[PDB]
Structure 1
Amino acid sequence: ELRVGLEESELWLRFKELTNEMIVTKNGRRMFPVLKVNVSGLDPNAMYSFLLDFVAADNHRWKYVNGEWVPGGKPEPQAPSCVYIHPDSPNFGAHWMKAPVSFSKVKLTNKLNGGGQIMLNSLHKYEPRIHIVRVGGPQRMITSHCFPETQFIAVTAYQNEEITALKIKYN
């Protein structure tokens, strides 16, 4: 059985208990904390690509009002984010299981851009999600995993200074 776990969940949970925020810029900003995934139960000899996307956790716009995040009253349907291919992809199961799969080079943007960067909507709440795609083999297979612990609101600047402080303390 394929097992997927979050590395450094301890630290993600500190961010989550304050409501996590991730900066988006026109050129695109790397994530802190970085999503790192523990994977076991792959076929060491089979070929796989690791994909990352962001699910809109709800259909609302959020605003930091008097020291607290509060949703708008006018939901709109969100639509899927684009997919980021882990740059090690494609690769052997052995490669992926030898150390945590680290998405350190994904950049989050607010503007439709050349390539690589993933465009999110500012002030929407997102749940990171990976897909492990068995490729090259006869039977293509996908396994998906969500990381509730890694939820964040996309922001053009930090609103909760408690988040600013945690980001600096641990980077």
Structure 2
Amino acid sequence: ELRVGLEESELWLRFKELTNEMIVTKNGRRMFPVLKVNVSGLDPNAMYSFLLDFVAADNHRWKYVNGEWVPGGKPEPQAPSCVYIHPDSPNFGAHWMKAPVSFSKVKLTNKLNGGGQIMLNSLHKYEPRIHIVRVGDPQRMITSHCFPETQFIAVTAYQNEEITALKIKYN
């Protein structure tokens, strides 16, 4: 059975319990925590690519008011659906399964200025999603997994001082 498990789930849940925030900038910012997964049940002999995208979690935006995240208005039009290709792609099943798969280099941005960046809307909530694509498959077999522990609000600056402090503590 194909199993894709979140690494450092306890660490993600500490951020999630405060409501997680990720900075977006012109030139793009790496995530903390970094999304990492363990994989079992691939064909060790087959070749696969790993893709990452971000799914809009709500039909409204968010605002931080009196130390609480609350509905903040109607959403902006959805950001272009940018996909990040894990730099190890394409690779054998055995490669993906022998050690955790880390998306350490993906950058989140609020400006379309190139560089394999992912564009997100500030004050909108996203859920990371990993796709496994089988190479050389006439059926283009793809299996996608969502990671609800890793949900965050995209921000130009931290709203929750507890998030600012958690980021410094664990990073």
TM-score range, shorter chain: over 0.9
Match of 2:144 in 1: 144
What are the ranges of 5 or more consecutive residues in structure 2 without an aligned counterpart? none
| Contact 2:76/2:121 (<8 A) preserved | no
TM-score by length of 1: 0.95
List gaps (5 residues or longer) in structure 1. Answer: none
In 2, Cα distance between equivalents of 1:139 and 1:31: 33
- Over aligned residue pairs, what C-alpha RMSD do you find? 1.3
Q: Secondary structure at the match of 2:54?
A: strand
Deviation at 1:75, TM superposition (A): 4.2
Is contact 1:47–1:137 with CA below 8 Å preserved after alignment? no
Paired residues of 1:55 and 1:80 also in contact (CA < 8 A): no
Conserved in 1, the CA contact under 8 Å of 2:75 and 2:124?
no
> C-alpha displacement at 1:81, in angstroms?
2.6
Equivalent residue pairs, number: 171
Q: Deviations over 1:57-109 (max 9, x none)?
A: 00212111111111124345536631000000010000000110000000000
Q: TM-score, normalised by structure 2?
A: 0.95
Runs of 4+ in 1 over 4 A off after TM superposition: none
Match of 2:19 in 1: 19
Q: Is the 8 A contact 1:59 1:78 kept in 2?
A: no
> CA offset at residue 136 of structure 1?
1.8
Provide the identity percentage.
99
- Kindly state the Cα deviation for residue 113 of structure 1 after the two structures are TM-superposed: 1.8
The residue number in structure 1 matching 2:73 is: 73
